[PDB]
Amino acid sequence: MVSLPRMVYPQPKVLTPCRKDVLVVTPWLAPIVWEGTFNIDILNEQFRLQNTTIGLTVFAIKKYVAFLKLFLETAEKHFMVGHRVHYYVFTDQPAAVPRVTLGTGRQLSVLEVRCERRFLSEVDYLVCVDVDMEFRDHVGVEILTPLFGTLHPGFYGSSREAFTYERRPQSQAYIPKDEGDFYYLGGFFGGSVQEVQRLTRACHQAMMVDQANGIEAVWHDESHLNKYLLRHKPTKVLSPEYLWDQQLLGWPAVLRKLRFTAVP
Ligand SMILES: CCCCCCO[C@@H]1O[C@H](CO)[C@H](O)[C@H](O)[C@H]1O[C@@H]1O[C@@H](C)[C@@H](O)[C@@H](O)[C@@H]1O
Numbered sequence: 137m138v139s140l141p142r143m144v145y146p147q148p149k150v151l152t153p154c155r156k157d158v159l160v161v162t163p164w165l166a167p168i169v170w171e172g173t174f175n176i177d178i179l180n181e182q183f184r185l186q187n188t189t190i191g192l193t194v195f196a197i198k199k200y201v202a203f204l205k206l207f208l209e210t211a212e213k214h215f216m217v218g219h220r221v222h223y224y225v226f227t228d229q230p231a232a233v234p235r236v237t238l239g240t241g242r243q244l245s246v247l248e249v250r251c252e253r254r255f256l257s258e259v260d261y262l263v264c265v266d267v268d269m270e271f272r273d274h275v276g277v278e279i280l281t282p283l284f285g286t287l288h289p290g291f292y293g294s295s296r297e298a299f300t301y302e303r304r305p306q307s308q309a310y311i312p313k314d315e316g317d318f319y320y321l322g323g324f325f326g327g328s329v330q331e332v333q334r335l336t337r338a339c340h341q342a343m344m345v346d347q348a349n350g351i352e353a354v355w356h357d358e359s360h361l362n363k364y365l366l367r368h369k370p371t372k373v374l375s376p377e378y379l380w381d382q383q384l385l386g387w388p389a390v391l392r393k394l395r396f397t398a399v400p
Pocket residue numbers: 288289290291300322355358380381384398
């Protein structure tokens with residue numbers, strides 16, 4: 137918006153692809169975020185000049201409160217470092233939330249559960265993730281955009297017919313075998329506050345319609361998220377570097393970094 141300052145960095149090479157092993161842009165021209173595609177210094181400048189605030193939301197119900205300490209401590213080392221961050225922890229056990237030391241410009245709010253406009257006034261972007269995870273490497277502003285989904289680590293190389301989308305036409309989440317771009321994760325999505333609220337509102341309404349008709353999608357919210365992103369294309373797609381399970385899937389050559397991973 138304001139001009140970027142002078143910066144010294146390698147010149148982009150028009151005749152050299154960033155990657156010869158993976159797709160780095162979708163058919164609707166949204167970038168697919170892989171290591172080796174972005175210069176983080178340029179992106180950090182762009183987002184800091186806008187004084188960007190990122191909200192990170194997690195739910196920790198019942199036994200999942202045990203995952204909060206590692207989740208938050210590692211987020212402090214790797215998530216949006218240098219930028220304003222507001223953590224929102226939705227839990228049924230407020231007194232069980234660990235006291236984690238936060239860097240400057242970062243804050244945490246504990247919301248007890250069994251608001252909407254609140255997010256609009258407190259943050260610019262919302263990132264919604266699973267709590268039984270830990271950050272192991274950089275997760276930064278390269279992911280920010282109006283609406284993003286993340287490629288599920290178990291299906292990124294799969295054909296659409298093999299995707300575990302909801303296949304019963306009676307469900308609002310129904311996707312037939314000849315449709316679908318990717319299989320996105322329910323555990324890592326986000327975007328501007330406005331777009332995230334539109335997505336969550338749509339999934340809530342679709343799930344209510346299914347409940348009324350006596351049907352529950354095969355993968356619950358994730359099935360609905362996939363239907364939403366099929367019909368409302370995300371403006372960025374995150375590669376599986378952003379949500380990986382090393383125990384189950386190892387460390388493939390196509391992954392130069394494992395950024396956020398499942399906890400055993
Ligand atoms: C065909 C081989 C696929 C291996 C990954 C399966 O992951 C599960 O996928 C379903 C949809 O088919 C759901 O998304 C489910 O939540 C996934 O399991 C969870 O994520 C994986 C990566 C792993 O961490 C599991 O332990 C989780 O339960």
